[PDB]
Amino acid sequence: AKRYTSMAYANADEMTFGVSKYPVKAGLDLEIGAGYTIPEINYAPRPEAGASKEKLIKEYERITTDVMERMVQVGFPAIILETEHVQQMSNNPSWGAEVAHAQKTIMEKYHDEYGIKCALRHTIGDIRENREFLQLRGDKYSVFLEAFEQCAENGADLLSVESMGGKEVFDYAVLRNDIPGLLYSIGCLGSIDMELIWTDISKIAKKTGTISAGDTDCAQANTAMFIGGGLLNKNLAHTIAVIARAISAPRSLVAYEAGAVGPGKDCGYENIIVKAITGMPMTMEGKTSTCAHSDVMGNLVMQCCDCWSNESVEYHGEFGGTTVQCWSETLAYDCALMNTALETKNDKVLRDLMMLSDRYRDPQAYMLAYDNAYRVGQSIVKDGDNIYLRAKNAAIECCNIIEEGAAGKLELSRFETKALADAKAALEALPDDMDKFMDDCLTKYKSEVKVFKPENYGF
Amino acid sequence: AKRYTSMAYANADEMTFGVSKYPVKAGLDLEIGAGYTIPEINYAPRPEAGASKEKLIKEYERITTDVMERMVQVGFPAIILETEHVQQMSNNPSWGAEVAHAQKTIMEKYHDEYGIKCALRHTIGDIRENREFLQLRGDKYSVFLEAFEQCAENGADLLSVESMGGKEVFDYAVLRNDIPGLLYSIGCLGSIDMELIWTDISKIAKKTGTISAGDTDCAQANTAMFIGGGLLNKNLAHTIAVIARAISAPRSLVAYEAGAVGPGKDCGYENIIVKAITGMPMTMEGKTSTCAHSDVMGNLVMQCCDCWSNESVEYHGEFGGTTVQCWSETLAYDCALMNTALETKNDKVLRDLMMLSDRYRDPQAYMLAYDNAYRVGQSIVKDGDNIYLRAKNAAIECCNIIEEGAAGKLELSRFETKALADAKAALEALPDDMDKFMDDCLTKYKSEVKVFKPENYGF
Amino acid sequence: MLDFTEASLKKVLTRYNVALEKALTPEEAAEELYPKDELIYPIAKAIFEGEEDDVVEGLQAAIEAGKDPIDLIDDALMVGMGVVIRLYDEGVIFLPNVMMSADAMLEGIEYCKENSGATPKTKGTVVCHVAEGDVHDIGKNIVTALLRANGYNVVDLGRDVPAEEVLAAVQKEKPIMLTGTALMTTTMYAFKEVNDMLLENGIKIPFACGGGAVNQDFVSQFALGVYGEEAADAPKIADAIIAGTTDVTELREKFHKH
Amino acid sequence: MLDFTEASLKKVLTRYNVALEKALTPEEAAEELYPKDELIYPIAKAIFEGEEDDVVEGLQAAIEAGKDPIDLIDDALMVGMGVVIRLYDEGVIFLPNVMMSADAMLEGIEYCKENSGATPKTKGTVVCHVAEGDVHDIGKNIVTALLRANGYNVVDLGRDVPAEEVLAAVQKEKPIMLTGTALMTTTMYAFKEVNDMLLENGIKIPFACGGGAVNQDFVSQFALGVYGEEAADAPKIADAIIAGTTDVTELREKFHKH
Ligand SMILES: [K+]
Ligand SMILES: [K+]
Ligand SMILES: [Zn+2]
Ligand SMILES: [Zn+2]
Ligand SMILES: [Zn+2]
């Protein structure tokens, strides 16, 4: 709704981890972006626990107890718990609500005993879909909103979702090196959907005195990343994955335009670009989220993180204790290193060290390096009012950034270089006018993708 | 054999991570302490894999393939695999040999294709024991040696053991705040057994062209730490755990005196002291070994590591891939940060940041801080020819160190403080003459500990 | 901000993929494999390029300067495709290049389906599905695309597919092979229902199981189960049914062992 | 090298144990709990202090100025020990203080043997063992102690214990409760052997299982199995046998639900 047309920071060099321009106060005495990074632990219940509401509540009480116990045994000052709903917690609003209430109760107990700072994030499933297609504005919509407000009324401090707007056209395009289809699905359909939902979520957050935290392009940009996989895969050019990431930034940006205040969702790798624009805090994930997946920017993503996440891990036993204890201890220590750097005014060198670790590992890391991310940010805000053109700007800026890198020390394969050159040309041939582009794609994808329903986006 | 009476380094500030004064060359184009840190991945097969030799060999093949595959997919330039023998691999020497062979074969295939540097470490089991007692010089001794040489002849690059000298008296002493018993078990009995085995181990390394790597006081010092547990535990005062650690330093030092060259075993937290004395490279484990256990010095132990380990994890599936893959990726990334620091001449500040992170977390961490570790180093070499007296010096120096800490910003509980004070007085009441102490202890533990067999120590 | 020297970077990481890339460009590589049959040529090249118009254009001229109405599928489309598949296995091209190519071929097949009545011939039917409760499409689609692109008829049962529906389709279509894909722990056990309900109706065909949440040990507790990790493993196992092996134990022996 | 300001240290970590420590020294806290019975007092202070030389001397003086050789077990030794356990529970003293006190008390119990003839009496018999293949003593030793401290009699079967031998001990001593401790995945399965081989010999006493490698769902798969995660759980689960609960499912209801 209220679009960004300038940057929150004067230059990339002002950005650092654990501080952001507009901090968020939430939960039990916690502050985010306020001069300390925070570990944010994620977890998935075992398949059996999903059988009933009571089994699910119990599993999450074991998770929460195990986590808070570990934090106080190792002396950590602060922790965030993120509960990513299984579908049944969102489809039945009161289920997620009762899990939220049960978790908050154990956290309040540890906060009263020890004074440990903490907050709870609930991430509602995007349930606006059936077996045949997306139903972004249908019957499930009202249930979607009830899931948010119920969890907000019963203990959740931060509200997030990984929304599905444009996912269907994305899925078709990403498999086909259809760059304009990437632009339309992520930058356009995604942006439009994001504005609808985030407007409502923020209203709910305000009414219930909780925080409208943010979204992630996980359904599109992360999918491109996983299909791309490691350095030796052959399923998606990494030079195209990175372009998807560039476009994801003005899409994810819309949450904040529409009332969200951060921290953004861990799996929003694009959050570095978003932070450079909004000056809001963001959670990141990388080397300590390998329990969920491999990535090629393990250290770099820490560069300006405010919260540090393990993404997800099943809840089960390891020699060192419970899965959620093992990873929360590692996240917490990573945050201790960063906090020691802040307290001693050595954050900037450490931020640089983190960035440089991965700058040259892959075009996907290269672009996300805080200086290059800020550059992408600049390219979006110069047409900030225009959801299409800002996204197109980002995509081409991305291409320029990678080309420059490749002319220095970024070592791309011939194949990667070609895919990049093809996509830049595809992007430069597009019209500047949004309507022109929106209309051509509407009729193109209506035709090429039969599961694509324009009513999902108010068309 | 040849005792240390001076320090390899002129002062603590010369110490850093990824470099040691005396580097170790080994395996497939790998170098240790040569200007880069190296991840060292550990693992335990599932119970089912122990049925037959072939299932065991198979499990290790899967582990090895999974690790090498991940390293090349994420662009990591180096890796060490450590296989800690299950008991059956050591009791039947050819079992360990054949696992060694199957692992090296795969490692060669990857090294040939991609040029990734790697080395294989086999850690023989200390099998010199039966159901009723230690048998450190019994019939099992020759089998013990056969394990080292068979593995060394069949692909193992580094040779290690976690040896049990003094374990029986330690186990008795640690439950009783018997500080002198700690001194005797670890410092005296431990040191005597260490010299026997490491003379033979080194002889074998030389004969087979492999590396006599080093030992760990796991069986004593780590037991004390694990019983000490978290900050809120009530099983062993942390001020007694750190004393046990200080004494382990000259015990573990014996391996090097007797011919090992490093890198020492990961669970040798006292390796920081050992490095300061010897200038030899050492593996460490902390924040990224939480799959095996919690500790109270997650970041500090990186301060001067040469290799960086996850200690151990069961081989099984996680969302992100196989357990050895998730943890190897985190280790390798931790190394990448360190190596970037080195490349840009920022290692010393990062070293300080890692150290300062945990310096105040616990007395166990405070002492292990590289400046304090060095000081404990100095207290050892000033009587280096004398194994009792050097150990007593370390224990008393440790007490001094924690006390100075406690008068500064180290915040000890009353209970911790009293227990330190009781231990210092008990150490200070002991005689300087070794034979006296040896004789007092011989007769005291003969009477108090029925499983104690003086012949295990040549008495 | 910090930067590396060339020597430093070289020490810190290695993009292993760069040095393993073959010298020839995809185009040059394709050129070494195209038939020089003048008539079949510009079709094979058109498939490789994912350029559907040129596939049609090239098919119109080949039935006018000769015949082969239905044959052009095998003589021109499946030869063009055999080039794409080859280059994909050798890693000189990537998945999307195969997808674009299969799209261009499918439109070239259905254009033959309009100048025929003859009904085309396939190596056999394969039924594909995603375990019920699971929306994860991609891996199935890549199994779908590879199969078709290797010369198989594919009835793709779609996403949240509920067993009863699978049973019914192995009946309607009598396929040589069924495939399954699961990605959530909350979902892999729909391979149960299907394996049991194929047995509880007397059906004995290979059940190629794959998916992120799935490994070689999980599919072995099923008599019909056969693991494939790569999507490129689906047609490779389907070809072992053209060879005669219906026995699952014998398939496992020449396909398992990871 | 770097150091923190006080303000900074306070932000980066918290030694949570420090603020939680009660004000009374252990010494003053035991003082409040000692029986003020003149002749019994020096023996209770002796037990807490874990000082055996003063335990005998205090006991001798007690049987001289009064009577009660065997009676002092429950009047002078169990009362002092009960102070020790309370303070351990409240966390004002640590394990090694409990151990030294148990050493001191056990050396008192056998000095009461030397003036008895009458036989001492206990609340039942517990057999304790570590799984076969397993060398991890410590947890078993803590369970041992806390059992001997809560008034029970314990035959300690030791380390690497083969099951045939658990049978034989359970037969001889007719215990009310069997404890087992396993620490390795490679070793927890010795509870199988034990459980089956008790049912196959028709015994139905509760088998309370613990150790690092073990959890609730694991012990529940055996019929005789009870879980207890902490060592304190050992007497608490044995008190319910003395309360008259022998049914595993009845016992589990109170003690599972972790
Ligand atoms: K997620
Ligand atoms: K070990
Ligand atoms: Zn996500
Ligand atoms: Zn160890
Ligand atoms: Zn696990």
Closest ligand to Cα B311: 2
Cβ neighbours of A73 in D, within 8 Å: 16
* A to B CB pairs, distance under 8 Å: 155
What are the two backbone dihedrals, phi and then psi, of residue B38, each rounded to the nearest 5 degrees? -130, 130
| Sign of CA pseudo-dihedral C113, C114, C115, C116 | positive
Q: Which of A175, A353, A412 sits opposite C96 (nearest CB)?
A: A175
User: Residue A76 in contact with residue A116, Cβ under 8 Å?
Assistant: yes
Pairing mode of beta strands D177-181, D125-130: parallel
Of B180, B131, B242, the residue nearest B425 (C-alpha) = B180
Pairing of strands A307-309, A38-41: parallel
Whose CA is closest to A238, among A124, A405, A14, A3? A405
The ligand whose atoms approach the alpha carbon of A223 most closely is: 3
Find the angle CA(C127)-CA(C129)-CA(C131) to the nearest 5 degrees: 145
The rounded distance, in Å, linking the Cα atoms of A188 and A182 is: 9
Q: Contact at 8 Å (CB) between B408 and B372? A: no
- Rg of chain A over all Cα atoms, to the nearest angstrom: 21
User: Edge-to-edge strands of the sheet including C153-161?
Assistant: C153-161, C125-131, C177-181, C207-210, C225-227
CA distances from B213 to B91, B102, B118, B153, B417 (A): 21, 21, 15, 16, 37
- Phi/psi region, residue A252 (left: phi>0; alpha: psi -120 to 50; beta: rest), is alpha
Cβ pair C3:A234 closer than 8 A = no
Which ligand is the nearest neighbour of the Cα of B223? 4
- Interatomic CA distance for residues B367 and B357, integer angstroms: 14
The letter for the amino acid at A349 is V
Residues of A in contact with B337 (CB under 8 A): 299, 353-354, 357
Burial zone of B6 (CB within 10 Å; 0-12 exposed, 13-18 middle, 19+ buried): exposed
- Ligand 4 mean position to B163 CA, how many Å? 9
Quote the CA–CA distance of A138 and C236 in Å, as a whole number. 43
Local structure of residue A219 (DSSP, 8 states): I
CB pairs under 8 A between A and D: 39
Beta bridge partners of B321: B318
Where in A188-268 does DSSP place strands (E)? 211-214
Verify whether the Cβ–Cβ distance B115 to C2 is below 8 Å: no
Q: Do B231 and A312 touch (CB under 8 A)?
A: no
- B176/D185 touch (CB, cutoff 8 Å), yes or no: no
Q: What burial class does residue D235 get, using C-beta atoms within 10 Å of its C-beta: 0-12 exposed, 13-18 middle, 19+ buried?
A: buried
DSSP letters spanning C131-177: ETT----HHHHHHHHHHHHHT-EEEEEEEEE-THHHHHHHHHH--SE
Scan for tokens 């929304």, then name that residue: A163
Reading the block at residue B95, the tokens are 């079992």
Place of tokens 């048998």: B135
- From the CA of A217, the nearest ligand is 3
3+ Cβ–Cβ pairs closer than 8 Å linking D and A? yes
End-to-end alpha-carbon separation of chain A, Å?
Answer: 18
| Shortest alpha-carbon distance between residue B299 and chain A (Å) | 7
Query: Between chains, do D258 and A62 touch, taking CB under 8 Å as contact?
Result: yes
- Distance (Å, rounded) from C-alpha C228 to C-alpha C206? 12
For residue A84, how far is its CA from the centre of ligand 1 (angstroms)? 7
Interface residues of chain D, partner chain B, Cβ below 8 Å: 1-4, 6, 9, 12-13, 15-18, 20-21, 25-26, 88, 91, 93-97, 99-100, 103, 135, 137-138, 141, 158-160, 185-186, 189
Residue pair D236/D177 in contact by the 8 Å Cβ criterion: no
Annotated binding-site members of B: 162, 218, 267
Identify which of A136, A3, A75, A34 has the alpha carbon closest to the alpha carbon of residue A342.
A34
Q: Residue A182: name the closest of A91, A99, A251 by CA.
A: A251
Contacts with B362 from chain A: Cβ below 8 Å: 75
B83 contacts B103 by C-beta, under 8 angstroms:
yes
Under 8 Å CB-to-CB from D188, ≥6 apart: which residues?
D131, D182, D211, D213, D214, D218
Integer Cα distance of D232 and A323 in angstroms: 25
- Could you tell me if B252 and B288 are in contact, meaning their C-beta atoms sit under 8 angstroms apart? no
CB–CB contact C88 A361 (8 Å): no
C-alpha B83 – ligand 2 centre gap (Å): 10
Test the C interface: residue of A171, A223, A235 with most C CBs within 10 Å? A235
Residue with tokens 């695999």: B81
What subunits touch chain A, counting only 3 or more CB pairs under 8 A? Answer: B, C, D
Cα–Cα dist A138/B216, whole Å? 64
Give ∠ CA A238-A239-A241 in degrees, rounded to 5.
60
* 3-class secondary structure per residue, chain B: CCCCCCCCCCCHHHCCCCEEEEEEEECECEEEEECCCEEEECCECCHHHHCCHHHHHHHHHHHHHHHHHHHHHHCCCEEEEEEECCHHHHHCHHHHHHHHHHHHHHHHHHHHHHCCEEEEEEEECCCCECCCCECCCCCCHHHHHHHHHHHHCCCCCEEEECCCCCHHHHHHHHCCCCHHHHHHHHHHHHHHHHHHHHHHHHHHHHHHCCEEEECCCHHHHHHHHHHHCCCCCCCCCHHHHHHHHHHHHHHHHHHHHCCCCCCECCCCCCHHHHHHHHCCCEEEECHHHCCCCCCCCCCHHHCCCCEEECCCCECCEECCEEHHHHHHHHHHHHHHHHHHHHHCCCHHHHHHHHHHHHHCCCHHHHCCCHHHHHHHHHHHHCCCCCHHHHHHHHHHHHHHHHHHHHHCCCCCCHHHHHHHHHHHHHHHCCCCCHHHHHHHHHHHHHHHCCCCCHHHHCC
Give the distance from residue C15's alpha carbon to the nearest chain B alpha carbon, in angstroms: 5
Q: What does each C-alpha distance from B387 to A440, B160, B239 come to in angstroms?
A: 84, 22, 23
Q: Peptide bond before B77: cis, by omega within 30 degrees of 0?
A: no
Q: Is B434 exposed, middle or buried (0-12, 13-18, 19+ CB in 10 A)?
A: middle
Residue A123 CB contacts under 8 Å (≥ 6 apart), including other chains: A82, A83, A84, A85, A159, A160, A161, A162, A265
CB-CB contact of B177 with D100 (8 Å): yes
Chains near C (3 or more Cβ pairs under 8 Å): A, B
Chain C hits for B317, CB-CB cut-off 8 Å, are 215
The token duo for C94 is 């990537």
What element of type H or E holds A145? helix A140-153
Q: Where are the beta strands (DSSP E) in A191-233?
A: 211-214
Mutate to test the interface with B, among C10, C16, C17, C219 (most CBs of B within 10 A): C16
Q: How far is the CA of B84 from the centre of ligand 2 (A)?
A: 7
- Spatial contact of D182 and D132, defined as CB atoms under 8 Å apart: no
Mutation choice for A interface testing from C22, C95, C183 by most A CBs within 10 A? C95
Let me know if A432 is exposed, middle or buried by CB neighbors in 10 A (0-12, 13-18, 19+).
Answer: exposed
CA atoms within 13 A on the CB side of B207: 14
Distance CA A248, CA A269 (A): 9
- Name which of D3, D21, D160 is nearest B413 (Cβ-Cβ): D21
CA distance B290 to B293: 5
Neighbours of chain D (3+ CB pairs under 8 A): A, B
Pairing type for strands B30-34 and B19-26 reads: antiparallel
Cα gap C195→C211, rounded to integer Å: 16
Token look-up 């510009």 returns C42
- End-to-end, the C-alpha distance of chain B in Å comes to 19
Alpha-carbon distance values, C102 to A175, B148, C96, C234 (Å): 11, 57, 10, 16
Provide, as residue numbers in chain B, all residues whose Cβ is less than 8 Å from the Cβ of C4. 340, 343-344
CA distance B402 to B152: 42
Q: How far is CA A373 from the centre of its chain?
A: 15
Q: Are B389 and B432 in contact (CB under 8 A)?
A: yes
| Burial call A20-35: b when 16+ CB within 10 Å, e when fewer | beebbebbbebbbbee
The DSSP bridge pattern shows strands B317-318 and B321-322 to be antiparallel
Residue among D38, D100, D95 at smallest CA distance from D66: D38
Residue A117, number of CB atoms within 10 A of its CB: 20
**How far lies C114's CA from each of A365, C103, C110, in Å?**
49, 17, 7
Query: Which among A170, A175, A414 has a CA at the least distance from the CA of C95?
Result: A175
Would you give the DSSP letter of residue A389? H
Q: Are A176 and A459 a contacting pair, CB within 8 Å? A: no
Q: Which residues contact D117 (CB under 8 A, 6 or more apart)?
A: none
> Helix B271-278 vs helix B370-381: angle between axes, to the nearest 10 degrees?
60
Task: Report the C-alpha gap between B95 and B53 in whole angstroms.
Answer: 7
Domain annotation for chain D: domains and CATH numbers: 22-121 (1.10.1240.10), 122-258 (3.40.50.280)
Give the position of tokens 């044959």: C71
Find the ligand nearest to B40 CA: 2
Which candidate from A13, A50, A231 shows the least CB-CB separation from C17? A231
**Residue A244 C-alpha to ligand 3 middle, in angstroms?**
15
Give B445's contacts (C-beta < 8 A, 6+ positions apart): B169, B172, B181, B184, B452
Sign of CA pseudo-dihedral B406, B408, B409, B414: positive
Which residue, B302, B353, B358, is CA-closest to B330?
Answer: B302
Structure-block tokens of residue B168: 């029986």
A182 neighbors A243 (Cβ within 8 angstroms): yes
In the numeric block, which tokens belong to residue D82? Answer: 């009960």
Is D13 in Cβ contact with A77 (below 8 Å)?
Answer: yes
CB contact at 8 A, D98 and D145: yes
Q: Is C51 left (phi over 0), alpha (psi -120 to 50) or beta?
A: beta
Task: Output the CA torsion B312→B314→B316→B317 (10° steps).
Answer: -50
In B, which residues are within 8 Å of C13 by CB distance?
A: 75-77, 336
- The residue with tokens 């080195």 is B342
C136 annotated to bind ligand: yes
- The torsion angles phi and psi of D35, rounded to 5 degrees, stand at -65, 125
The 3-state secondary structure of chain D, one letter per residue: CCCCCHHHHHHHCCCCHHHHCCCCCHHHHHHHHCCCCCCCHHHHHHHHCCCHHHHHHHHHHHHHHCCCCCCHHHHHHHHHHHHHHHHHHCCCCCHHHHHHHHHHHHHHHHHHHCCCCCCCCCCCEEEEEECCCCCCCHHHHHHHHHHHHCCCEEEEEEEECCCHHHHHHHHHHCCCEEEEECCCCCCCCHHHHHHHHHHCCCCCCCEEEECCCCCHHHHHCCCCEEECCCCCHHHHHHHHHHCCCCCHHHHHHHHCCC
Query: In this structure, are residues A98 and A154 in contact, taking their beta carbons and an 8 Å threshold?
Result: yes
Please judge whether C2 and B75 are an interchain contact, meaning their C-beta atoms are less than 8 angstroms apart.
Answer: no
Max CA distance (Å), chain D: 70
CB distance A165 to A457 below 8 Å: yes
CA distance D63 to chain B (A): 28
Chain-chain contact of A360 with C13 (C-beta, under 8 angstroms)? yes
Chain B / chain D CB contacts < 8 angstroms = 85
A421 Cα distance to chain centroid: 28
Per-residue DSSP letter, A221: I
Give how far Cα D101 sits from Cα of C203, D39, D45, D55, D145, Å. Answer: 71, 19, 10, 10, 10
Is C16–B346 a contact, with Cβ atoms under 8 angstroms apart? no
d(CA D102, CA A209): 56
Residues with CB under 5 A from ligand 3 (ion): A 162, 218, 267
Using an 8 Å Cβ cutoff, are C141 and C192 in contact? Answer: no
What is the bridge-based pairing of β-strands A211-214 and B307-309?
unpaired
Domain boundaries along the sequence of chain A: 1-459
| Residue D143, C-beta contacts closer than 8 angstroms, at least 6 positions apart | D128, D179, D181, D210, D231, D234
Q: CA-to-CA distance for D224 and D191, rounded, in angstroms? A: 10
CB count in 10 Å sphere of residue C215: 17
Residue of chain A nearest D257, judged by CA positions: A58
Alpha helix (H) residue ranges in chain C: 6-12, 16-19, 26-31, 41-48, 52-60, 72, 78-89, 95-112, 138-150, 164-173, 190-199, 233-242, 248-253
C touches D, CB cut-off 8 Å, minimum 3 pairs: no
Cα gap C89→C91, rounded to integer Å: 5
Reduce the DSSP state of residue C126 to 3 states and report it.
strand
- Between the CA of A42 and the centroid of ligand 1 the distance, in Å, is 9
Inter-chain touch C258–B62, beta carbons under 8 Å: yes
Q: Residue with structure tokens 């994912």?
A: C50
Q: How far apart are CA C23 and CA C1, in angstroms?
A: 36
- Separation between Cα atoms, residue C149 and residue A164, nearest integer Å: 30
Q: Which residue shows structure tokens 């990437």?
A: A182
Per the listing, tokens 């022996």 go with C253
Taking the CA of residue D95 and the nearest CA in chain B, the distance in Å comes to: 5
